Symmetry: C3
Subunit: 255 residues, 3 copies
C-alpha cells in the first residue's frame, strides 16, 4: 500500500488485492504456456506433416507470436506480485495503465503483417505505438485535456484501422479456403476486440464512471488472454495450414 497506513477507504485504490493477484497469476500461467507451445510447434517443422526446414531452422520472424505471449506472461507475473504485495509497489506494472501495451501492441501488428505480407510494415508499427502512447498520457492527465489526448489517439487509430481492414480484404482472396477460416477468426479478434479497448476508457472512472478500476483490471485480463493467446494460436494454425498447401503439397496461391 503506497500510503503508509494504506489506501484511503473508498478510494479507486481500495480494491480486493488478493483476488486481483490470483487472476493475474492464472493469466500468467495460461499465456506463458500458450507461448511455450507456440515456439515448440514452430520447431517441429513445416505444416501438419512437420516437414523439415531446409536450413534446419525456422524463419526468425515466425518466433514473434510465441515471444509476444512470453513477454505478456512475464508481465502478468510481475503484476501478480504487485497485487499480492497490496499495490502501489516501486516496480508496478499495474500503476501506469497502458504502459505494458506500449511493448506488445506494436509487436502484435508486426507479427500479423509479416504473416500476411501486408505493405507498410513500418507505418503500421508506428501508428500503433503512437496510439498506445496517447493512451498513457490520457490516463495520467487529470484535466479535461485527458480527452484531448484520447482524441489525438483516435486520430491515429481510426485511419490505421480502416487502412488495415482494406489491406487484409485484399490478401484474403489470395489464400486457399482452409486458410481463410483461420484468418477470419483472427480478423474478428482484431476488428472486434481492439475497438473494445477505447470504448472501455469512456465508461471507466476517467470517463462516465460506470466501471470501477478493479473491474477494469479483470476485463483487461480477459482481453489480453484473447488478444495475445487466442490470437497467437490462430496465427500459428494459419501458418500450419498455409505451409501444408504451399510447401508440403507445393501448390500456388491465387494472387
Amino acid at each position: 500500500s503506497r500510503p503508509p497506513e494504506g489506501w484511503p477507504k473508498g478510494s479507486i485504490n481500495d480494491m480486493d488485492y488478493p483476488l486481483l493477484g490470483s487472476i493475474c497469476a492464472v493469466c500468467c500461467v495460461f499465456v506463458a504456456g500458450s507461448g511455450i507451445w507456440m515456439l515448440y510447434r514452430l520447431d517441429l517443422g513445416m505444416g501438419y506433416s512437420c516437414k523439415p526446414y531446409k536450413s534446419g531452422r525456422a524463419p526468425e520472424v515466425n518466433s514473434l507470436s510465441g515471444i509476444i505471449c512470453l513477454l505478456c506472461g512475464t508481465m502478468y507475473a510481475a503484476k501478480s506480485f504487485d497485487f499480492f504485495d497490496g499495490g502501489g509497489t516501486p516496480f508496478s506494472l499495474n500503476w501506469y495503465w497502458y504502459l505494458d501495451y506500449v511493448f506488445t501492441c506494436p509487436l502484435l501488428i508486426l507479427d500479423f503483417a509479416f504473416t500476411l505480407d501486408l505493405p507498410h510494415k513500418i507505418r503500421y508499427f508506428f501508428a500503433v505505438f503512437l496510439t498506445l502512447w496517447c493512451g498513457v498520457a490520457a490516463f495520467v492527465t487529470p484535466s479535461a485535456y485527458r480527452f484531448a489526448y484520447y482524441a489525438l489517439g483516435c486520430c491515429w487509430f481510426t485511419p490505421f484501422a480502416l487502412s488495415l481492414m482494406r489491406h487484409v480484404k485484399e490478401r484474403y482472396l489470395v489464400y486457399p479456403p482452409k486458410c481463410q477460416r483461420w484468418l477470419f477468426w483472427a480478423c474478428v479478434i482484431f476488428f472486434g476486440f481492439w475497438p473494445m479497448f477505447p470504448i472501455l476508457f469512456i465508461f471507466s472512472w476517467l470517463g462516465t464512471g460506470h466501471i470501477s478500476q478493479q473491474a477494469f483490471y479483470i476485463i483487461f485480463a480477459f482481453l489480453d488472454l484473447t488478444c495475445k493467446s487466442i490470437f497467437g494460436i490462430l496465427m500459428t494454425v494459419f501458418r500450419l495450414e498455409l505451409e501444408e498447401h504451399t510447401e508440403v503439397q507445393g501448390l500456388p496461391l491465387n494472387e
Copy 2:
C-alpha cells in the same frame, strides 16, 4: 501549474503559456501536414512521371521521412496541451529538454543514410543517440558537471559531424547535377543547423544566461520545422529526381 498556487513570479517557468501553446499547435499542423504529403507522394509511384512500382508498393525505408514528421507533429500536439494546461503537467514533453529528440534525431540520420547509401549506418545511429542522451543529462544536472555532460556530448558529436561531412562529399559526385541541387540544400540544413542546437545551450539560462526559456521554446519550434519538415521535403524531392534519372529514364550514376 506544478506549484499549487502556480509558478513563482519571475521564475524560469513564469512564461506566456497561451502563446507557447499556440505556436506549438501551429507547428503541429504544419509538420503533420508535411509528413502526410510526404507519404502520399511516395505512394504515387517512382519519379515525377509517377512510374508504377513493380511490387506495387514502395520500399519500406522510404517511409521514414514522412513517419518522422508525423511523430514530431504528434509530439508538438502533446506539447501544445501542456502549455494550454499552463505547464508542469504529469505527461509533459516540455519538461525534460531533449527527451523528445532522443526518438527523432537518430531516425533522421537513418533516413539520410538510407537515402544516400552512406556506410556505417549503425555507427551513425548510435553516435546521434548518445549525443542526445548527453544533452538530457546536461539539462537535468544542476552542478558544474552539467558541463562535463555537455563536453561528453561534443566528444560524440564532433567526430560524427566530420565523419559524415567526408562521406557525403564522397557520394555527392556519384549523383547527377539536378540531384546535386537538392542534396546541397539538405547539407546546408544538416551542416548549418544541427550545430546551432549546442550553440544555443551555451547562451541559454543554463550557460551565459542570454536567452530565456520561453525564447528557447520558440527558437526550437522554428528549428524543428526546418530540421524535420523542410529536410523531409528536400529528401523527398531528391528521391523523385534520382528515380526520374535511374528508373524512369534508366541512366547510370557516375560512381
Copy 3:
C-alpha cells in the same frame, strides 16, 4: 548527496565517492579505448592480411562489438560524474542497479549470435532483455517479493543458458582449430562470468548481507571490463582468424 545535509552516516550510501569516481573514470577510458581499437581494426580489411572488402566497407553487424564498448564507456563516464558529484544526482546511472545493462546485455548476445550464426536470434535477444528487467525489479522492491522477481529472472536465464551452451557446442566443430582457441576463451567468459552476476545478488546487502554496495560497484567495474572489453577483443580476433581461413586463403568450414 541526495539528502540536503548528505547521506546519513553508516547508510548503504555512506561510501567513498572519490575512489568510486576514479575507478569508473579508468574503467571509462579503457573500455572506450578498446572499443575504438575494435572499430579501427575492422576498417582495415579482412583477416590478418587486411584483405580489402569488395564493397569497400565492412558488414554492418561487425560494428556491434565496438559499439557496445563505446556505449559502456560512455555510461562509465556518466557514472564517474555522479560519484564525483557525491552521489544521488538527478541523472544517475549508479542509482537503479541493472538499468544500464538493459541496453548492453541484449546487444552483447546479438553480437555473439551474429558472429557464430546461432539460430533464434530474436528468442535469444528477448530472453536476455527480460532477465535484466527482472533484476531491475528485484533491486527496487523492498519486500520479500524481491526474491519472487529474482526467481522469475532465473526462470528466463536458466533455459537460455542451457540452450546457448547446446547451440555453441554444435558450431564449435564447424570451425578450424585456430578459431576454436578464441571461441573457447569467449565461452569461458560467457559461461564463467555471466553466472557470477546472479550469485553476487545473493551475497549483497539485498541478500545475505556479506558484500557492501561500495564493494558491489567495484566488482561490477571489473566484471564489465571483462564482459565487454575482453569479450569484444576475443570476438574481434575470432573474426580475423576466421577470415584469414575462409576469405584470404579460401578454405571451407567442416560444417
